[PDB]
Amino acid sequence: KGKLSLQDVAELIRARACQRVVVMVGAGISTPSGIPDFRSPGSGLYSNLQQYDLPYPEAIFELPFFFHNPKPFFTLAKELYPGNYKPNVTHYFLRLLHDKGLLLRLYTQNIDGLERVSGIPASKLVEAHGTFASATCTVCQRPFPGEDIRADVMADRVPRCPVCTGVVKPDIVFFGEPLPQRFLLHVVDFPMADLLLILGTSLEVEPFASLTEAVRSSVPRLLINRDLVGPLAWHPRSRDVAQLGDVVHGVESLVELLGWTEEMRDLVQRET
Amino acid sequence: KGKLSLQDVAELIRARACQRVVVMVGAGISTPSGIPDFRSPGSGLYSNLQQYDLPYPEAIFELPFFFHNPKPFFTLAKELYPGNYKPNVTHYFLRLLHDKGLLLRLYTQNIDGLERVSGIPASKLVEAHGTFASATCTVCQRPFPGEDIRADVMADRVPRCPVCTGVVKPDIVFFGEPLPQRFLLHVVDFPMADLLLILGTSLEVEPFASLTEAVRSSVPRLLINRDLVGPLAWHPRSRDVAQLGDVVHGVESLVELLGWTEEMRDLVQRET
Amino acid sequence: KGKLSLQDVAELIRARACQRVVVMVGAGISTPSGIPDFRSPGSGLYSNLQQYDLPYPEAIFELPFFFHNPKPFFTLAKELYPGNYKPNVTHYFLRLLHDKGLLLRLYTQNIDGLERVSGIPASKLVEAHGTFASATCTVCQRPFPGEDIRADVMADRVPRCPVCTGVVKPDIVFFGEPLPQRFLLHVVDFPMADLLLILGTSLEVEPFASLTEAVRSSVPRLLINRDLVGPLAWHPRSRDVAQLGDVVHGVESLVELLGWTEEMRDLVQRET
Amino acid sequence: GKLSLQDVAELIRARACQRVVVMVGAGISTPSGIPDFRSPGSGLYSNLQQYDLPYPEAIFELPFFFHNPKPFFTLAKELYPGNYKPNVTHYFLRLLHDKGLLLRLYTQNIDGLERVSGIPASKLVEAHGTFASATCTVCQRPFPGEDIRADVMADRVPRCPVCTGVVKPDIVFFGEPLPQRFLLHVVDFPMADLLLILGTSLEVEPFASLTEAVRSSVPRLLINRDLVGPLAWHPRSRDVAQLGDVVHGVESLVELLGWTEEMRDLVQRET
Ligand SMILES: COC(=O)c1c(N)n(Cc2ccc(F)cc2)c2nc3ccccc3nc12
Ligand SMILES: COC(=O)c1c(N)n(Cc2ccc(F)cc2)c2nc3ccccc3nc12
Ligand SMILES: COC(=O)c1c(N)n(Cc2ccc(F)cc2)c2nc3ccccc3nc12
Ligand SMILES: COC(=O)c1c(N)n(Cc2ccc(F)cc2)c2nc3ccccc3nc12
Ligand SMILES: [Mg+2]
Ligand SMILES: [Mg+2]
Ligand SMILES: [Mg+2]
Ligand SMILES: [Zn+2]
Ligand SMILES: [Zn+2]
Ligand SMILES: [Zn+2]
Ligand SMILES: [Zn+2]
């Protein structure tokens, strides 16, 4: 019936009737910046991690495993460390969401840091999987210096804090660590949201997929990702719209439906 | 003075101060149903997994060992398939937590499926080590309901894919496979818990065992198990309680202090 | 018919058919002399190390932890340096095979030093986890007799070179150090041995646990432990003999089944 | 009449020594370019420390190998057959076998160069195993070491019967049952009339212990950068010690044997 297309969605934001946007982003926004992804067979990182004959492929994120075997995690680290990559039209669009005062929160499962590198502030972010921007000693459990354990990460060396080696670990959240207290914000963010935008994520690894259903039944869910997936696939609602297809072309056709094409082109030029 | 024992944890639940309870369970709640447990000797499943000389007991969850000889795995699978065994009091106790609206989520290392038989619904469950409810071809990767396979598995026959002849395996987690998609619901579940209950597990198979340290620091952690194990034995917290002894006996004393002895008897009778 | 019982074994030693007994012992032969154990739930030295924050009980043998806080490790040694505890029937029973000329070699995971104290010379021993006999500094690597650094451990100091003025340390094997030089004497011992005797050991830490299979398949394999463990639980041979029960009584029966009871009583008296 | 290198060379020339037992170590492979993981600041040593292993020899530990096989295959890559050639120490041992004087050559190297030098397998105890043979850890199917050599830039897992899993070169691991061929030592050493200890530290047993197994009348010649093991701690009256660079030492002894020109044509023809 009176259903929603991307046209309908753009003029909700133009008519500023949607002004509290909660955005969920996964790897479908960072693959077009050159980011390998460790869960894609045929990635240079997948093959080199596949080589580690690990138990589960995600043990690289497990603290007790890390204490006896740190080098696989650090194989992923230099593939994804900050300073080698650039944000794209996806990251910078979300910066425009913020600037125009429309962003409630950006939930990311990426760890490249290009949400913050694009100018979105820390207070608008939930970096669900942590950051490479700070690091801690595993022994003397204090440090911080972010890039600092860098160069070690370039040079295939396991970084060490000046007083107990200590395999100083980038602040990627590991199984067995206390989890981010900021993740508790989902409790109040997902009710408040007058709009759920799902960008370039397979809604495959929890809690991300469950969260798409925390939003009020009146709230629309717009999916810009190759294929409908997760609850949008299985439990769709009346206001669910999806631009199945390439994320980048996806965000440009939505950006051209808002009229931000120029602001963008300007911002990607200014920023870069 | 007012520190924490078995009475106090019952007092909190009856008073509904605890209403978001998170539970972890392992093998010790499956042994009282007569389940063999393949790891301790003197089990018939030992003398029967001796017809196949192996290096590890674990080697039965290793894809390359499966890729000659599925027979050691499939004699574990014949002994454990849904049918033979019946949920015991501890199961039904958990089912009563969900009946009375106290179960946030049940995390299990078991693969017998007696949490599902006891009537706890699937949405309440994270099956850490997979399930026999479903099957996928090792070559095709085509999915299969598990009863397509129970004819063959209940015949000392190796089930083959009808589309490509590849050997089909139950969706029991194997070394090298990505961890269950639902294991990450703990990011949301455990900081939301106001009580953590641990029943019948050694807390030695991670990432499962590290989940003990993901409830907030004030939240009590009740252990019902023979001995102190895992993070509860090296990082004990103030509000932890260790009811040490036979697993069934521990729960019976908790039900009595809860005052559920008749409601349990009844439910258990009607369910068997 | 002629399958092997603790009786049978004691006849081959009396008949001098087994004249090359290699022997493996672990913390289970040490315990009955009062040894506290660093990894047992609720003991003297266990709560000591637990007083500090360690993520592992095994971090005391971890070298970057020794460069942060060494006072854990040393207040273990302060409760294991020789003199404090006295050898028992197990130490002296292995003292008597040597005396009677039957011992090829004693292999031991123990560090309390009691095998030496019992009258077994250094060349009969292979000390897998090191010894409190010699010392060494942790910068220059200068050698020090154990007394040298024994003065200071009992003086609660942290012992330091005149060179580095840096913390010296007992030659207890630490993670990242190379395994004792004597460990590879097994390449000649075990194939030369006609009896393998395994005492009070969980057989859980490699490369110690692997020695069990280094004997020729002809060689009787005998375990005095509380329960059937390690490679004798999963890979038993035609000639393995399991005396399950307390280690001290298992020796005391065999000591009677060899009829050295009078010898043991007088060897012990004289040594005390 | 107390022994020096000229006299040992003389005992060989007269065939007064015809049953030579030889023990060799990483010092006869380092002149070929083979790194050596034990030697601090080598190539291997630094990359292996990137794996924070529980002890450095863990790379030959069999249950460690079923978890991270990488640190071992990291050693295998810089040691694998087909990157190096036998140097002059090998051909000198090959000249000793061709002259009918070698009783047995005992080696702790796994680089295979003794065999490439032409020494018969029957004169060889490879006390650490070999890379000429590889075994699937799951099905025990044998492979030529050259089957997996291509992968020896990451990690090998062939197909076979009970396989699809990690194929392990036959380096002897703690956990694998130890070489039956090594029992030859019980008779070779009591019967040697000369012991050549070439280019080994006697750091890793049983070799250090085996220097004592020759009869007290049998000279022990060490050609090695330094005095090591029971020769330093328990010297006998008939030990000679050519300390300094193994290749110079061997070339020196070859001069005293009158063999410099036969080694010429040999090394030349073999390379
Ligand atoms: C970019 O991926 C990451 O950094 C991940 C990461 N850090 N954990 C562990 C983790 C996340 C959140 C938490 F609260 C505690 C522990 C992950 N688990 C995964 C499980 C399945 C599939 C993909 C996964 N990816 C990650
Ligand atoms: C009935 O137990 C099961 O179903 C098991 C199962 N599926 N795996 C394999 C596995 C678990 C977690 C992972 F991340 C990857 C692969 C197991 N490993 C074990 C290891 C030691 C002791 C018991 C074990 N039990 C199981
Ligand atoms: C009192 O026992 C000891 O002296 C130990 C000792 N010295 N390490 C360190 C070690 C490092 C490398 C290596 F190859 C052998 C040993 C230990 N690890 C243990 C780990 C788990 C459980 C008990 C352990 N016990 C010891
Ligand atoms: C190139 O060195 C190797 O290949 C080694 C190797 N294969 N083992 C293990 C081993 C040898 C013989 C046996 F009968 C059973 C197991 C080693 N252990 C060492 C211990 C200390 C220092 C160096 C060592 N090196 C090796
Ligand atoms: Mg730091
Ligand atoms: Mg001093
Ligand atoms: Mg093959
Ligand atoms: Zn530190
Ligand atoms: Zn198939
Ligand atoms: Zn010093
Ligand atoms: Zn294979």
Side-chain angles (χ1 to χ4, degrees), chain A residues 56, chain B residues 38-39 58 61 109 111 129 172-175 205 207:
Chain A
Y56 51 113
Chain B
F38 71 104
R39 291 194 296 139
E58 295 115 287
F61 311 120
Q109 314 216 90
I111 67 153
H129 287 174
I172 303 300
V173 168
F174 262 31
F175 295 109
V205 196

Side-chain angles (χ1 to χ4, degrees), chain A residues 48 50-55 65 67-72 156-160 165 167, chain D residues 47 49-54 64-71 151 154-157 166:
Chain A
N48 282 140
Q50 202 50 47
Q51 281 296 27
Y52 270 105
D53 197 46
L54 302 164
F65 186 94
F67 275 143
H68 319 299
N69 196 4
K71 174 99 180 212
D156 308 303
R157 306 169 218 308
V158 154
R160 331 207 64 105
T165 88
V167 200
Chain D
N47 327 75
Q49 216 138 300
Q50 285 340 292
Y51 314 96
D52 220 283
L53 299 130
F64 199 82
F65 187 69
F66 317 146
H67 161 277
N68 226 334
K70 293 252 139 57
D151 302 316
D155 171 319
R156 310 80 198 181
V157 281
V166 177

